[PDB]
Structures are given as C-alpha cells and as structure tokens.
Amino acid sequence: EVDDSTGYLTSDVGGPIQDQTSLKAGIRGPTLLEDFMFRQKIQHFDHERVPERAVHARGAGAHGTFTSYADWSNITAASFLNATGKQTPVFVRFSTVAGSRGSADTARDVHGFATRFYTDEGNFDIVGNNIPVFFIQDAIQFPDLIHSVKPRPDNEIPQAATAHDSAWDFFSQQPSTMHTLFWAMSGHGIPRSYRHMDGFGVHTFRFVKDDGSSKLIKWHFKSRQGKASLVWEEAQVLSGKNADFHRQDLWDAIESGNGPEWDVCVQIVDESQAQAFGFDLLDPTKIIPEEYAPLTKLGLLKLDRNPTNYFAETEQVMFQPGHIVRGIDFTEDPLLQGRLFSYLDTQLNRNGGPNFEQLPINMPRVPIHNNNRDGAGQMFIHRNKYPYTPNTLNSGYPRQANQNAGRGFFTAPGRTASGALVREVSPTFNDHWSQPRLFFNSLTPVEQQFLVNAMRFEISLVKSEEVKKNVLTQLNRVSHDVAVRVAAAIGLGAPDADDTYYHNNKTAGVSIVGSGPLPTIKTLRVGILATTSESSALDQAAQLRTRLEKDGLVVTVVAETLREGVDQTYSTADATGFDGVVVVDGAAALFAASSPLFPTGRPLQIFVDAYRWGKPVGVCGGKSSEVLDAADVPEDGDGVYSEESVDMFVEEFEKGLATFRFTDRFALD
Amino acid sequence: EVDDSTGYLTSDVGGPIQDQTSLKAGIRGPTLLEDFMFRQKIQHFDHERVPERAVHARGAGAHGTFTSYADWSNITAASFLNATGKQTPVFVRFSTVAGSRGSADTARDVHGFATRFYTDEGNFDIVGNNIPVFFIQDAIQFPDLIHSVKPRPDNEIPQAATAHDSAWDFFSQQPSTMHTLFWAMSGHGIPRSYRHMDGFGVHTFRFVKDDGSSKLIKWHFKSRQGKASLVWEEAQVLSGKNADFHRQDLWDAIESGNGPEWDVCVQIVDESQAQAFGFDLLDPTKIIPEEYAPLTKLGLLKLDRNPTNYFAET
Amino acid sequence: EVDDSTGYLTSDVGGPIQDQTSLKAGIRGPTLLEDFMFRQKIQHFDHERVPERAVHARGAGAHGTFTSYADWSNITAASFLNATGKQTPVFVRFSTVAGSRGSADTARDVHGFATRFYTDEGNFDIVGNNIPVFFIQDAIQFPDLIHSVKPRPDNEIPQAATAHDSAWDFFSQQPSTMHTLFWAMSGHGIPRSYRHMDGFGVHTFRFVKDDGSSKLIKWHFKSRQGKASLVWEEAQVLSGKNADFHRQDLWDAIESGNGPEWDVCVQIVDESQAQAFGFDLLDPTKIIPEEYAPLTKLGLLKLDRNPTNYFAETEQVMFQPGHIVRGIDFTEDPLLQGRLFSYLDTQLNRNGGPNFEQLPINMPRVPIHNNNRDGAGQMFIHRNKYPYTPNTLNSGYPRQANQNAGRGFFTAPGRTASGALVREVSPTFNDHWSQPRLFFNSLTPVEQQFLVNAMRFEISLVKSEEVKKNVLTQLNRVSHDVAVRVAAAIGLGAPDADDTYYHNNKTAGVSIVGSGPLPTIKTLRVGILATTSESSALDQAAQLRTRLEKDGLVVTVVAETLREGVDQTYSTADATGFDGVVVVDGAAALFASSPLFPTGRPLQIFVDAYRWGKPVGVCGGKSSEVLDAADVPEDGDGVYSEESVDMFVEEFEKGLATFRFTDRFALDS
Ligand code: HDD
C-alpha cells in the first residue's frame, strides 16, 4: 500500500517536481519537449486503460474470509478444507455477462460469482454464475453465443441486452440454451443485489482423496441474505437512475458491518451415478435436482472488506479454473475443458505480458518454486542459476511433486478414455427441453407470468418474422402454454402442442418469489417522504428514523431541500432507490401542485411507482386513512400500511419488508 | 471488405475446417491439445478487446463528405479548401467524455465531435467538442480534471457523471472551469442527438497562405438540423430505457437518407487582435463573441454512410 | 530475491506440481488440453523474450557505489554531491551500439557507458559513451544515422559493422560525423575491456546552485585501470573465439575483488564562455580541449557486485537522461533535447506497458508521491483516493515542489529564448573538420597508422565507386595525408589538398598508445604454454604460476590434455585469450602433429601473440634457441629470454604494463 496523505510530489523515480504548469518558452510561448514533468505525467494518463474482460466486463469485488466447518478428509484431500474452523482469505468478484465496463448493473443477464481462495496449498478459484446451468455444451461455441448476445457488429447496438435479433436467432437455432434462457428470463436475470443471489460452479468437478479415490461434485454457494429480485419495469428505470446500484449496495453493506455471507455447499455423488439421473453429468445444461442429491454445507464464506484501489484489485484480478489444488480435479465436461485454455490465454490480452500472476491481487500466500523466467514485467530476482530439470548443479531442486511426494496436484487415477478421436456430440446430451420445463413448473404462478412477460418484451423487439417463428417452435417444445402466451404478444399462432418433453415434475429451491420471507431485513432501504412546510412532518420523520435505524435498515428522509435530518431532495429521489416507502402525514399537501425545486408530480410519482412495483408502501399518521384515496392506493391492500402508532407502524412495515414483494398487484393471463 | 455470404469455414490461413465440436479422446472423453480448430478460434476471442479510449470511450461514427464553397486561397493554402465544389471524404465520431464503453449516451457531459478530412494533401483532423470552451488552461492538468470527474478510484462510483464530491472539489478549486461547467449544466450537457448539436475546435488555430502570412482562427460546425436538447428527468429515464439512443438516432437518420449536415465555418481575426477583445486568444476557456467577429461559411459537411464493422471503423 | 535451493516445484500461484511429463490420454495417447501444468510452463517460455534495445542491444552491467570527494554546494545543489564521503549506490551498463543482442563484444563500434545513481533525491542517470563526441547535431537525424549504420534492410547484412556502403554513404554526406568517425576508427573503437575505457556525457549540461545560478559542464569518467585497446586483426578473431569477451572480463574482475574504478570529473565553464573556444558548446560534435578547461575530480565510482539474474537486472534496466535531479539542468543542445523524448517513449516498446519504473532495478531508493494511476502491470495499491490537484479532500497533498519548496527540480532561471520558430541549423555548428584534425594530430604515429588502416579496411569493403570518392573528399578536408594514404588502398587519386581546416594543434589525453604504461596489471591474463611429455615443463609452469598469481595476474597453463595444474587444452586455446604469452623451455618439441589439437596450434598461439604486439617470452635454459625456431627476435622489445624465474617475471611484468609493443607494425612512406 502506498501512502500519499503527506509529502511533496515526486516523479516515479522519487525526484521532487511540480505538475500544474507546462514549461514554456516565454510566459505566452510554446511548450518545451524537455518538459519531463509534463511527459511522464501525460504518458501515464495516456496508458491508464487496459482491455476490459472479454465477457463479465462490468463487475465489482470484495475481500473476505472462508471458514471450514470440519475436517473433510473423508471426501477430499483439499487442504483449505482439512480442519474445523480453518480460515482461508478470499476475494470475490460479481459481474454481469454481456455489457461493457460502464453498462448498467441492472440489465437482464446471467451473473458472474467468481471466488478466489488463497489457500496454504496454492490459489484455488471457483469461477461460477448465479445460475446453475449454461447456454452451450461445448466451449468451442463460446464465441458464437457471445457474438450473438453482445451488440450487433455493424452499429454496436444494443448495449447489455438479449433483446435483439441475433441473440434469439442463436437461442432458437441452438436449443441447448433453453434451460439457461429460462433462468435468465426469470427474476434470476435481475437480482436485487449480489448479496441476494446464489453462486454455482455449473460444471461437475471431482473431489479426490489422498488414497486416489474420487466422487463427482457440484458447488453451490447459498445466500444467507435470502433470494430477491427486481421487477423489469423497475430495473429499466434503475439502470438510468443508478448504473452503479449493485456495486453501491455491496460496498455499503460491507462499510456498515453487514458483510454478506454464503454457505459453501456441495452435492456429492459416485462415479457410477454419471448417468443415473436421466441425463449426463458432463452436460453443463443440467442440474442434479435437490430431490436426488442433498446439499452438504462445507463452510462459511463472508465478505467484510472493500478494496482500496478498484483498478489495482478488482480490475486486475485474474481468475482461472486452471487454478486448481490437490483434492479437486476436472471432468470431461466439454465446456469446462475449453475454459481451461481460455482463462490462461486471455490474461495475456489483459495484462499485455506473461507475468500477471505477480500482481499483488494474483499472488499466492505461499512460496513459489519453479523455473519460469524472464518475460516483460518480471518482478522477481531469481537466485537459482540452473533453472532446468533434471539438474545436478542445483542438487535436483526444485523437486517434482505428485501423488506421493510434496503434496503435488494429481489427476484422479480412476479416469480413463476409450474409442476414437471424434468431433462428435454424445447422444446423451440431446434432451434440451425437459429441464427447462422442470424449472418453469417449479415457479410460483406470478413468477411464471413475469417470465412470460420478459419473453414477450424481448421477442417483440426481434425485427425478423422468421426468427420469431423459430423462437415459438423451441419455446413450444418446453411448454405449449408458454408458447401460446408469448405468441399472443407478437401476433402469431403458437404451433401445435408437442408433448415429447412435457411433464409435471417440480424441484425445490429454484424459485425466488416462492422462497418465503427474507431471513433478514438489515441493510434494506426505506424512503420517508416528508416536507419542509409542516414542522410536524420532519418530526414524524425523525422518529421513524430512530426506530427503523435501530433495526439495521438504511433510512432516507426526502424533502424539497436539504437541512438537518434530510438526507436527499425530491429532485434526486426515486422509487428505485428504496425497498419500501413511507409518507409522513404532514406531507399530504405535496401529494395533492408544483415547485421549481423538483419536477411536476415527483413526490406522488415516487409513491405510486413504489406501490406498482410491489413494494411495501405506507402512510404514517392521523389523516393516513385519506392520503391513500388521493394517491389511488387501496387502504386494505396487502403490504399497504396505515397506522397512527409509530411503534405499530414499524412493526407492521418490517413484516412487509421481509415479504419484500407483494405479488397480488400483477395481472395474470 | 471481406465477404462471408457464401463458402465453407476456413482457418485464418484458409484451410477448410469446422468449429462446432471440440476434438475429444472418445465421445465422453477430454479435449485434445492438438485441436487447432478450437485453439485458433478461442485465442481470437480471448484477444478481441483493446483498451477503450482514455476519455471519450463512448461514441459512434459515420462516413460522409465535405464540399468546399469556394477557392479560399485568399485566407489559407489548405488544399481541400482551394476550389469551389471540391469534395473531400470524411469520417466523424461523436462521443461523451467521462463514461466508459457501454455507459449511456444521455448522461450529462461535454461531447466530442471529431472530424477526419482525408485530403489530397494528407489526413487532416479537427478534434473538437459540442461546447466551444474547455475546463482548464494547461494540458498538464488534464489528468487532474479527468481523475476528478471520472468515478471514485476506491469503488468506481459513479459512472458517467459529475454528480459527486471529487468533481466539484475540482471545479471549486480550479475556477478556470466555470465557463465549461456552465455550458455542461445547460442543455448543452444533454443534446437531443448528435445531429442537433454544433462542433467547435475550441482552440485558436492559424490559417497560413503560401506567401507565409497568418490569421488567427476558430472553427465552428453549425448544425443544419437546429439545436435541441432533452430535459434532465427525461435523460435519466432514457439512459435506462435506451443507453444507445444517440447512436441509434444517427444510424437511423443515415439509413433513411436524412444524413445530418453542418456548415463548416470560421471566425477570422488578425495576429494583432490577440488581446483586443478583453481576453487572451490563447486561452481555451474563452469565446470570441459573434458580435466582435462574424462567422464565414467555408463549406458543407454531410454524413451519409454508416460503417460496415463498428470495431474496425469506429 | 527468490530462493529455489530447496522445496517442491509449484505453479506461479504456489500449487505443488510436476513439470516433466505431459498429461496424456493413455500411455501412448495424445496430450490433453486440461494439462494446466504443461500450458503454464510453455506459455511462460513462449513469452520470455522482450524487444532488444533499439541501439546498444549488446551490453552488460554491474552494481557498485559512488563516493563524493567533497561538499560541492559551491557549484551545484545536487544532493548526492553535498558531503565529503557521501555514498550513493549505482548501477552501470556498458554496451556497443550497432549490434543486436547476440553480436560480438569486440566489433568496432562506439561504446555505451550508462550510469544510474540511486540518490536520496531521486534516480539520476548519466547516459554516455566511451567517446566524447557524437556523429550528428540534431536528434531528428538519429534514425538516419542508425539505419545507415545497421545491417542492410534487404538482407540484414552485415552484423555489427560500419564496413558497408550505406554507413559510408551517410558519413560522406553528413560531414558532422567526421569527429566521431575518427574516434571510432582509432583504438577507441576496440577497447581492451570496459574497464580500460573512459565514459563521457558528450553534451554540455548545467550545474545549478540553490541561489539559481548556473555553470556549463561536461562529464568525464576517467578510468583508473588506464586506457588500452586491441588491434584489429586480433579483435576479429576474438569475435569468433569469444563473443562474450568484455562481459566475461568485467564479471571476472568483480568476482576476484578487482572492481574497476573511475574518477567522476567535470569541466566547469561560464555561461558567457558558450562560444569562447572557437565552437558552440551546444554542439555535441565538439570537445573542450583540456588545455582550455581543466578537469575537476568530484568523486569515485566503483563497481563491485555482479547481478544475480541478468535478464531481471541488466536486460530490464531502463536509463533516461530525463532522470534528472535538483542541481543539474539541460542545455539547448539539439541532440540532447530530442533524447529527452526518445528514452521515455522507447520503454513502452521494451516493457509493453507504462509501469516500467516499478521494476526492482528501476525503482528509486526514496518514497514516491504522485497521482499516476492504473496502467497494465500496476504493482502499487494507492491509498489516496483523491488523485487530482488542486484538491481539498486530501488537504492539497501531494504538495507542489519547486525552487523554494520541497527541494523541487527547477529549470535554471537564467535560461532565455528569442527570435523566430525555425527548423534551421545554427551557423555556429558549421565547422565539421578542425576537431577531427586536432584529434588525429594528437595520436602517436603508430596510432595514426592503425586509424588509416581501419579506414583502408572499411572503405575497401564499400562496393560503390561514387561513395568511395565522396569519402575521400571528406577525409581530405581533415587531412590530405590521410586521404592520400587511404586512397592508396582502394586505388584512387586523393583529391588536391584543401587547407581551409588544416592545422597542427594538439590536445592531451585522447591518445591510448601514448598514455604511458598501465597504472596496474592486476587481472591481466597470462598464458603459459606447456606439455605433458616433459615432467620438467609442468614444474616450470607451476612455479611461474605461484610467482605471477602473487602479483594479481590471471594465469592459464595450457597443455595437450587436462590434469592437476593445467587450466585448459591447446584445442580450446588461442592468443586472444591472453595479454601476454610464456613458453616454458621443456615444451620446445611442440613448437618444432597431434590428434588432440589442430596442426601448428601451439606455435600459432605464440606467433599470433608476438604479431599482435604482446609481451612474449621463453622461460628456461634453451630459451636462447626456441625463439629462432619460432622466428621471434631475441633482442626485440617485449620479447623475454631468461633462466632466473624471479627475473623473468620481473621483466615480463614490465611488458604487461607497456601492454602493446608498437615497433612491430609497419608505417607508410
Ligand atoms: C471457452 C471460453 C469460455 C467458456 C466456455 C466460459 N468462459 Fe468465463 N470467461 C472466459 C471464457 C469462457 C474468458 C474470456 O476467458 C474470461 C474473460 C476475462 C477472464 O478472466 O476470463 C471469462 C470470464 C468469466 C468471469 C469473470 C471472472 C471475473 O470476475 O474476473 C466469470 C464469473 C466467468 N467467466 C464464469 C463462467 C461460467 C460460470 C461459465 C460456464 C461454465 C463460463 N465462464 C464459460
């Protein structure tokens, strides 16, 4: 860490200098080439930027700790997992997928959840998503998916969005994507925060024990903050009012001592069970339903420290599934296999040189011993002058590590191969439609509506008639109902039911709106709409504040202008900034009326928006009975709150915050 | 231009190949290092990105032409300006300033208006803004302005916005910025489209005649579509509903045969007049009011062709 | 520093691994993409190389220290010079100019001598040559000089040599080069070692005192090992027998506790004296003769520590004249001015990124305080989150440093400008011929012959008749005699004398052969030619060894095969490996064939040594007679014949100090 709280300005080589005026030939003359102060400064600036990540360019990171719950030697040799209470430092970056690095957090997308464990046996990375399955079955297709999903290559439109022709052209021609597509079209595509979503490794990996035996595994990071998501119409507005919403959220949660937590869990099954669930476990388009393999909680992951320099830490972190430790191994998942190549090659693009593992954030916490040398940006001075193997001149050091010596990584010895070298897809990968259906069946009826609606939204922006038809064809193969309802919005006939993959099987834990109330309401944001006219209004506010802040909520009092007790103005305020909204009684005048200090109708607009997006809304005070009829909000409606007793208003409101979304306000087909 | 409307897939060295399945050691086996089809394709993908521009990362471009209205030998030796009706191909890119790639077009910012004339005497670039004056008086200060205006370096917040402490800390400590600040806080901060804004060179330049004599000049690109701007509360929503608004707009105007146009104009004054208007003409925080030096229309700039590949061109 | 003397092989992120066999699908099967051990290792290897330096690609470096002799506050504000006995660590790299990084050390070239002082006020670099003047008067011409001097762009021939058409086309068309060209054609073009050459800053710089006043200066680094140089015919062989000669020499000198030393000196003159010596001091093609400004010894520079990793230290060191400290300033030397731009720009090519000053070898020894951020390979984590000026949010830190605060660098306030902006050469720069003549006049008659011979050698390799004529024209303007003698070798008539610049002025200190005996003979190499037949031969050798090694010499006993007391075989031996050669009496048989060395080798070594002007001798009884067989005159200067071992050494050591016996070389008539 470099401290600049005191001192005089120096060059990068420590010579004291100034940097405010160019060196000129006369007070009104031209600048001199010999002005090294100028050039060193501007050269640095000119070279500040590096290529953004090819995918997941938009994201944010934090420091934390992983703690093991036990000694898991019975399932894996992995050292970070070998003792009860063992603590490994971590760094996690969350991201969206398609958007470039300045795009909105709240676009609809799959989300990245990438975790580095800095273990005492090397760095170990789990590079996953908030959605447990992926669009494609072979890594070689990654550029096809990503090309089609990103902006059109002629005009680079649209940013951060699947709502254009090429994406759906791809989805409709590559049916493997149905499952992920359904996930992304649910609320999983627009989470309320990084803290309110899960992490998944997607691929099946292997646990390996010192005796060389292996089980097949799936990683799950389950959120202790619960599952929550935005509604589309709210996410759209948020993207404009606050492109930084998710990163501000994570930053804030950590600053206020509310670090988010996840249970790091696995599903464990036998090698013999590769095909025992009606699909191939090497297929990254499928989940093992919880019904057939329960989750084991391995340890606790907690984020509790924000970075100091975003660029140096978040932007430079370079994850790799290649960063593997003794106790884990890969599987023949053709998606996972290709990823191994990609993540090593891409960092050359991003770092511009081969020594990217030497950046502080990428360094391990244990010693390095190997014969890698040179390369641009070499930061080490190697003492071993015989960097070859086998040598006698350095006494045959460094020694080879393997199964039986030095705790070397080793491939699971059970793994075998047979047959021809082929560029052919396994027939066991061919069912693209069952699991999407399983997923859809497991959602509440409103969740289903929202999913249909997301699809209606996007498909209607697809210009090509032929592409829309092919979309309906694939959708129909998952559910005729879904096809029909989607087709209705784009004025086409859904094709005739095809029931080859229809079924009524459900699975638990994939639903957001059906996962019951949030386990905690700490850090949720409450907006209090007040005024500077009535002296009573601000007093009501101040009292709600004390009571709400006591329960860990984040309170904003809104008024026409700033002063003591007021956090922000109606001008800068918006419903998307709040999880619930409270109007204090004394502000009734404002909801019934114009001001040069905010746009017309703003105070009411905030409230009405909050209600229409399914949020806990309420009026607190005497004339509360009547402020609602003016606002056109039903007094008896679920999650609408009307009370005089401050203590009983809070108590009622806090129940609404836990329910989080009031689903009765949304029309069904 | 490379055509791919017919043919079989080839490597970059023209060997016909496939790219849909990895080469595996058995139908349910691991992928082979020797699969050159895979590695050449993924290597390309892994390396697609280049660093975004340090400022003006968010922007869009179009092809057009410039036509001279006269032989301007009386004021400059500049060849693209030396004949009535002389056509020079152009390429223009418009942009915002602070936002990264992917930030919304309708953030509040200064805007870039950058023109290349591919003249018969070399490429000539006028790299300007939609606002005729700039925040600072010395280029050595550029990183201070830009650091303060871009997101906070600890958390990269906020994107594409001067609405935070550091920006105003800078503006309040570096008063030279008041003029541009005022412009950016007007509707000039949030134009209705690229077509409904002007271009300015900002700095004073010199016209030079073959005899060696020089006048001082200021470039103005006056919009023939007129000036229009959004309202804030509208701009905010638009940033969410359509981050691509300005680029969609320009693309569409061109597709539909309504290419935007600008009169390329200059103010011309004498070397002796450097300090005759109550400020120094070397000061890029100042305009010469039209009341003291009228504009001369030099020619017409028109954009009428969209690019074929955004990356390769824009 | 990274220690690898013990431990198990790890990846760059510390995971223990092996690196000797690829992961294969079956014992006789193809290699797997998932083999991360393989790819990380090979990626590193594939990326080990960086671009070589655009010029001075072939060089070598060492660590040392500089000691000040006094408090020089009376002439400069420069802190590393502000106290008697003040020590500053240094790093120096010496080089040739034209050759690529694998070319021989002993090509004929100008030589680099670049010094970094890691001062307590910032890094300060003096980037100089072994020759005090440069070919051209404006930096903008540097690519022209270098293109013409390097290999031809069609076939890339010849390596490391001015002996081709383009070089002499340029020299003949750009007469400014005469002066340097004469130096390079002297023995200065082929120094005996880096240790036996001087360093020069070339340009006039300024010393600046805290009161703002300035003197004009010239840096001289005078060698405490004395000046010595090879002869051409010897250099050519050495290039083949040992491309690494100079670097070997420097390495060895330092390993054996004989670190080379230089007196760091300046010439100091007044601003008013800019044109007071009959040339413009801004002209880098001119010297201030010692007769008109004596040298002041400022301190001692000593090299005493070899690097640990060549690549990491020597290859990655990045010098810049822009690395200046308070107390020194630039002058309007149009060559110096351009260099300021180049050296900052070129490091982007070499390092591939803007953070090159963060490489350990380039870091300063004091803190860094500035607002430079980000860039590829950013190795710091900055704590100051308000990296702009002016700020209040970091209390206006870092503070501007200048003349009166913070010990800032500052431009000499006396410096002024006037007139028009012009791309024109000052008329004061127009005399390209006098100083070369001054130089030539100041060499011993043999030194003159050698220079003529070097010119005869090269010009005869110039294919083009027209270019040869234009060369003669330029040479003639310096000296008719030189033109005449050179013309004689290429069969052309020298043009008629032109005396505009002829004169007989001499200057001291520019001659090598006339600089008297060496002040030390420590580290010089002596070859003893012996045999394994006569038991007496090896006993003679062993006794010479003890005696010679006692005086700091490096001794090699040569025989047909190796054994105790024998350092190398006749097979691997050559005259170029020795500064003097001794045949022991008992080996006479060998000098009058064997499958253990090429025919005639033992005599070839001796005869070569004699013909190249080296101290040669036979030690023993029948010494009288071994010489007549060898055809070496017994009475000849630097030929030694004695029976008394103690007397032989004593005589021989005088010859080693004389170093070269110039009476063996024919002169013109
Ligand atoms: C064959 C190419 C390829 C394939 C099939 C995948 N990825 Fe990937 N991914 C990349 C190629 C890539 C990449 C181009 O190599 C990136 C971009 C920058 C980087 O570090 O690696 C990347 C980045 C990246 C990041 C950003 C990490 C960060 O924050 O820096 C996450 C979270 C993921 N990926 C997650 C996945 C998941 C869950 C996948 C499905 C199993 C997946 N990727 C398939």
Ligand code: HDD
């Ligand atoms: C000392 C540095 C510096 C200063 C004082 C300025 N600029 Fe700049 N500008 C840059 C350094 C820079 C740059 C970092 O060099 C950029 C970024 C990428 C590039 O190609 O140049 C750039 C980009 C850039 C672009 C984008 C062109 C494109 O779309 O590719 C425009 C229109 C401008 N600038 C215009 C200006 C104007 C009108 C200025 C005030 C009169 C100005 N810049 C001051």
Ligand code: HDD
């Ligand atoms: C503007 C072009 C230019 C001009 C006129 C010069 N140089 Fe230079 N020099 C460079 C541009 C350059 C360079 C291309 O930037 C190098 C190559 C590698 C590097 O870092 O700087 C360099 C390398 C270089 C090195 C090697 C440093 C090392 O060992 O790493 C020395 C010793 C010199 N130069 C010395 C000089 C002297 C004594 C000159 C005459 C006064 C001179 N150069 C003129």
Ligand SMILES: *[C@@H]1O[C@H](CO)[C@@H](O[C@@H]2O[C@H](CO)[C@@H](O)[C@H](O)[C@H]2NC(C)=O)[C@H](O)[C@H]1NC(C)=O
């Ligand atoms: C592997 O080891 C852990 C050791 O704790 C086992 O987990 C425990 O299982 C018992 C019942 O068998 C529970 O009462 C404990 O609470 C569990 N502890 C934890 C931390 O979960 C685990 O069952 C073993 N698994 C296998 C397959 O052998």
Ligand SMILES: *[C@@H]1O[C@H](CO)[C@@H](O[C@@H]2O[C@H](CO)[C@@H](O)[C@H](O)[C@H]2NC(C)=O)[C@H](O)[C@H]1NC(C)=O
């Ligand atoms: C858990 O893993 C750690 C790290 O690998 C083990 O501790 C290291 O063991 C090696 C060799 O056995 C020692 O030479 C190191 O000094 C150890 N490090 C420390 C901090 O003790 C540890 O033994 C493992 N524990 C279990 C129960 O298997």
Ligand SMILES: *[C@@H]1O[C@H](CO)[C@@H](O[C@@H]2O[C@H](CO)[C@@H](O)[C@H](O)[C@H]2NC(C)=O)[C@H](O)[C@H]1NC(C)=O
């Ligand atoms: C719907 O659910 C049933 C019951 O869970 C599934 O039937 C099981 O499938 C597995 C895997 O092939 C068999 O080995 C089990 O023994 C079956 N159990 C029972 C009770 O029938 C069925 O596969 C599911 N159908 C779909 C389309 O997912």
Ligand SMILES: *[C@@H]1O[C@H](CO)[C@@H](O[C@@H]2O[C@H](CO)[C@@H](O)[C@H](O)[C@H]2NC(C)=O)[C@H](O)[C@H]1NC(C)=O
């Ligand atoms: C430079 O020459 C142009 C070229 O004609 C002059 O512009 C013309 O001015 C007259 C009236 O003064 C008009 O009839 C023409 O139509 C003008 N043409 C254009 C394109 O403006 C111009 O006035 C001259 N300017 C100077 C300063 O000498």
Ligand SMILES: *[C@@H]1O[C@H](CO)[C@@H](O[C@@H]2O[C@H](CO)[C@@H](O)[C@H](O)[C@H]2NC(C)=O)[C@H](O)[C@H]1NC(C)=O
């Ligand atoms: C306007 O500029 C063009 C381009 O410089 C001029 O035409 C050139 O004139 C030169 C020298 O007289 C010819 O050798 C070139 O071949 C011409 N180039 C081309 C592309 O045609 C023209 O003379 C200029 N017109 C005026 C009025 O000054």
Ligand SMILES: *[C@@H]1O[C@H](CO)[C@@H](O[C@@H]2O[C@H](CO)[C@@H](O)[C@H](O)[C@H]2NC(C)=O)[C@H](O)[C@H]1NC(C)=O
């Ligand atoms: C600057 O100060 C130094 C410090 O002593 C002077 O160096 C001495 O000069 C006197 C002659 O004037 C000699 O007797 C000493 O032997 C010198 N010592 C050294 C180490 O050089 C130096 O002369 C002064 N120079 C000027 C220009 O005032």
Ligand SMILES: *[C@@H]1O[C@H](CO)[C@@H](O[C@@H]2O[C@H](CO)[C@@H](O)[C@H](O)[C@H]2NC(C)=O)[C@H](O)[C@H]1NC(C)=O
């Ligand atoms: C010689 O060298 C250093 C130049 O920095 C001086 O020591 C510094 O002196 C100032 C006092 O003015 C302090 O603020 C610095 O912190 C000191 N630095 C170090 C590294 O010791 C010293 O003053 C100079 N001596 C002379 C005689 O000028």
Ligand SMILES: *[C@@H]1O[C@H](CO)[C@@H](O[C@@H]2O[C@H](CO)[C@@H](O)[C@H](O)[C@H]2NC(C)=O)[C@H](O)[C@H]1NC(C)=O
């Ligand atoms: C040869 O040496 C003489 C003697 O110093 C030089 O003539 C002097 O030059 C200096 C500097 O220009 C003048 O101040 C004197 O007036 C001259 N002195 C005498 C005594 O004549 C001459 O410049 C030298 N010539 C060359 C070509 O180097």
